[PDB]
């Protein structure tokens, strides 16, 4: 099978196992969110006659999941199985002897309902107009115990029977209702939030990605996989253009998380980034001086002399894209074909002696990426400079100068820009909380037409309890 998608996410069974360690905490939340209504009636009891009962203010007093387990069910769902969840409820029982008026005042006894349940939640994933939706119509409960204990172990002779032969069943059924409802909601809340926070990651200012699902996620026995458009939005405008073709053989099932990106996604990025005016750099005096020193050079060398020349504080440089850069995915790495304009201005006393060179050129660079120590690492694999129109703007012009400047673009130019990019990208990752998850041995792979992100993750046992508290 093939899919039409710009971006594809694969979350494998190994990852779900790590996520299941937190299942208990989530099932807890559903129980705390449920609305247990008052159970009331007025039945005729053996010998006592009419009795006006009421089990009031049903609240959870204790919760404890024994063992939880996940299981991907081929072309269907996620079968989450919870065992021996010990739930203890608190309340006040209110009753009155109606027909036996001589039996004195009505009573209020505090009670504890002690249950133990087994749960099966079969969660089916669908694409609700680009958004990922959760559905668990198949939600099951198995009660081992459901004992009612009253304060002081009081019993006139009707409570226990009225509980077992009436309240037991109804309460059990109400409980399933409320639990499977609140699971279904919290399930959706996660999915919407996860998606929303993912678009928040993939977006900055007027630039944003379109993660609309290109169809219902795929469930197999080894993984769960979603397929998205990956169109870049600029200033709330998107072009719904023909989608690339994706093969689910290009992705494994060993790693926890797999990400597949068409080169068309990097191309939309170049389009938007370029058009937003993001693709430019300007350096002045002290900063320009620092940049050369950063790339290991002493500004007071015989070479750096006739250039700056005497007044380096006023020496300026500007690099900008003349056209949208051509980003391509190859096996050898990421290749960026960019057409730049490097303008050099070195002022002297008189504007006649001031050195001003404008290098109009195409710089092709094969870049390779890495993630280590919560930083993005870009490394130059191969490059090529093809000058187009190298113009001089004063009489202070020579081929030694022209070569010197051309080299500065090569030797310092490319490495500084490459650095600034890894700085700028890592910045965002942190600014969108990527630096919060334990990203275990990630691999950034490059292939002809696409790029892969293969990673295992350590889930932060705090990050859930954070979102989990932000509900009420
Ligand atoms: C298109 C990617 C660029 C790489 C190809 C171009 C190669 C270079 C071409 C020409 C060189 C001339 C330009 C030289 C300046 C660039 C270097 C730079 O100095 O800075 C990177 C700029 C930001 O310039 P600035 O004036 O705004 O910042 C100020 C920057 N300072 C703080 C460092 C001073 O580059 C950007 O903005 C672009 C990045 C904006 C993307 C963020 C938008 C949200 C979308 C996605 C999030 C991440 C997606 C990743 C996963 C999906 C795969 C695509
Ligand atoms: C850019 O620099 C030119 C000189 O630099 C040299 O040529 C570049 C093409 C490049 O190879 C660079 O590395 C070299 O150092 C400037 O051109 C010069 O301009 C002068 C004034 O027009 C000119 O002079 C005389 O020219 C004729 C012939 O000698 C006389 O008849 C006339 O009266 C002038 O006195 C000089 O010859 C000319 N050089 C060349 C090779 O043509 C160019 O103007 C400069 N650009 C700017 C905008 O300043
Ligand atoms: C690069 C970024 C690295 C971040 C690493 C990282 O932590 O990634 C995980 C983030 C959360 C998630 C997206 C994931 C994996 C599985 C996803 C989940 C599958 C089932 C979940 C449903 C809501 C059903 C829940 C049933 C339950 C009994 C309540 C769903 C879709 C929630 C989100 C996760 C990867
Ligand atoms: C004295 C000196 C001054 C002189 C004037 C200077 C002259 C300079 C002249 C020209 C400048 C042009 C030369 C520079 C060319 C730049 C080339 C250049 O660096 O292009 C690269 C830019 C970044 C990127 C798009 C790329 C490749 C890989 C991409 C990345 C792969 C994965 C990355 C994920 C976001 C993170 C996954 C890790 C996860 C957290 C686990 C992703 C998509 C980030 C972006 C890159 C190509
Ligand atoms: C930033 C991660 C990401 C999310 C994408 O869009 C969506 C939209 C909806 N669901 C998903 N899922 C994948 C996923 C995995 C890991 C993290 C993540 O987003 C997040 F970083 F925001 C999370 F940590 F909060 C999303 C989930 C989808 O596969 C599923 F399971 F619901 F079917 N991705 C598309 C690309 C990328 Cl790189
Ligand atoms: Cl009594």
UniProtKB/Swiss-Prot annotation:
Stated consequence of mutating residue 194 to W:
Reduces triglyceride transfer 10-fold. No effect on cholesteryl ester transfer
| Outcome of swapping residue 197 to S | Reduces triglyceride transfer 10-fold. Slight reduction of cholesteryl ester transfer
The record describes the protein's role as:
Involved in the transfer of neutral lipids, including cholesteryl ester and triglyceride, among lipoprotein particles. Allows the net movement of cholesteryl ester from high density lipoproteins/HDL to triglyceride-rich very low density lipoproteins/VLDL, and the equimolar transport of triglyceride from VLDL to HDL. Regulates the reverse cholesterol transport, by which excess cholesterol is removed from peripheral tissues and returned to the liver for elimination.
Cite the entry's keywords alphabetically.
Atherosclerosis, Cholesterol metabolism, Disease variant, Disulfide bond, Glycoprotein, Lipid metabolism, Lipid transport, Secreted, Signal, Steroid metabolism, Sterol metabolism, Transport
Compartments in which it is found = Secreted
State how changing residue 147 to P affects the protein, per the record: In HALP1; reduced secretion into plasma
User: Mutating residue 226 to A: effect?
Assistant: Reduces triglyceride transfer 5-fold. Slight reduction of cholesteryl ester transfer
* One of the record's GO cellular component terms: high-density lipoprotein particle
Protein family per UniProt:
Belongs to the BPI/LBP/Plunc superfamily. BPI/LBP family.
Record bears the keyword Transport: yes
Extract one GO molecular function annotation from the record.
cholesterol transfer activity
Pathological condition linked to this protein in its record: Hyperalphalipoproteinemia 1: A condition characterized by high levels of high density lipoprotein (HDL) and increased HDL cholesterol levels.
Query: Which superkingdom, per the lineage?
Result: Eukaryota
Q: What is a biological process (GO) this protein takes part in?
A: negative regulation of macrophage derived foam cell differentiation
Q: Which reaction does it catalyse?
A: cholesteryl (9Z-octadecenoate)(in) = cholesteryl (9Z-octadecenoate)(out); 1,2,3-tri-(9Z-octadecenoyl)-glycerol(in) = 1,2,3-tri-(9Z-octadecenoyl)-glycerol(out); cholesteryl (9Z,12Z)-octadecadienoate(in) = cholesteryl (9Z,12Z)-octadecadienoate(out)
Predominant location:
secreted
Matching entries from InterPro entries are given as: Bactericidal_perm-incr_a/b_dom, Cholesteryl_ester_transfer, Lipid-bd_serum_glycop_C, Lipid-bd_serum_glycop_CS, Lipid-bd_serum_glycop_N
Q: List the disulfide bonds.
A: 139-180
Q: What is this protein called?
A: Cholesteryl ester transfer protein
Expression by tissue, per the entry, reads: Expressed by the liver and secreted in plasma.
Check the record and name the CDD domains matching this protein: BPI1
Q: Could you say what the effect of mutating residue 412 to R is?
A: Reduces activity by 60%
């Amino acid at each position: 099978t093939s899919h039409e998608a710009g971006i594809v996410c694969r979350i494998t069974k190994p990852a779900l196992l790590v996520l299941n360690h937190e299942t208990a905490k989530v099932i807890q939340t559903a129980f705390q969110r449920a609305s247990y209504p008052d159970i009331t009636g007025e039945k005729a009891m053996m010998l006592l006659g009419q009795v006006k009962y009421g089990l009031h203010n049903i609240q959870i007093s204790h919760l404890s999941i024994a063992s939880s387990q996940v299981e991907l069910v081929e072309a269907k769902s996620i079968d989450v199985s919870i065992q021996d969840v010990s739930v203890v409820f608190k309340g006040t029982l209110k009753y009155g002897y109606t027909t036996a008026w001589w039996l004195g005042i009505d009573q209020s006894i505090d009670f504890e309902i002690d249950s133990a349940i087994d749960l099966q939640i079969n969660t089916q994933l669908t694409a609700d107009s680009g958004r990922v939706r959760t559905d668990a119509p198949d939600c099951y409960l198995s009660f081992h115990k459901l004992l009612l204990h009253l304060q002081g172990e009081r019993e006139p002779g009707w409570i226990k029977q009225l509980f077992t032969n009436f309240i037991s069943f109804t309460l059990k059924l109400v409980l399933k209702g409320q639990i499977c409802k609140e699971i279904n909601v919290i399930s959706n809340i996660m999915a919407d939030f996860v998606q929303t926070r993912a678009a928040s990651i993939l977006s900055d200012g007027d630039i944003g990605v379109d993660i609309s699902l290109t169809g219902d996620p795929v469930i197999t026995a080894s993984y769960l996989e979603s397929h998205h458009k990956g169109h870049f939005i600029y200033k709330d405008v998107s072009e719904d253009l023909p989608l690339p073709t994706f093969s689910p053989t290009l992705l494994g099932d060993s790693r926890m998380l797999y990400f597949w990106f068409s080169e068309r996604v990097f191309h939309s990025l170049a389009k938007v980034a370029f058009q937003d005016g993001r693709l430019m750099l300007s350096l002045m005096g002290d900063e320009f001086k620092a940049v050369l020193e950063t790339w290991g050079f002493n500004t007071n060398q015989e070479i750096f002399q006739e250039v700056v020349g005497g007044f380096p504080s006023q020496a300026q440089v500007t690099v900008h894209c003349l056209k949208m850069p051509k980003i391509s995915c190859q096996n050898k790495g990421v290749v960026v074909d960019s057409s730049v304009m490097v303008k050099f201005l070195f002022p002297r006393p008189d504007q006649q002696h001031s050195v001003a060179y404008t290098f109009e050129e195409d710089i092709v660079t094969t870049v390779q990426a890495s993630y280590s120590k919560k930083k993005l690492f870009l490394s130059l694999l191969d490059f090529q400079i093809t000058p187009k129109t190298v113009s001089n703007l004063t009489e202070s012009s020579s081929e030694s100068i022209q070569s010197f400047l051309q080299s500065m673009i090569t030797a310092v130019g490319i490495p500084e820009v490459m650095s600034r990019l890894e700085v700028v990208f890592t910045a965002l990752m942190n600014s969108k909380g990527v630096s919060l998850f334990d990203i275990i041995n990630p691999e950034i792979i490059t292939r002809d037409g696409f790029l892969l992100l293969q990673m295992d993750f350590g889930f932060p046992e705090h990050l859930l309890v954070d979102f989990l508290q932000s509900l009420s």
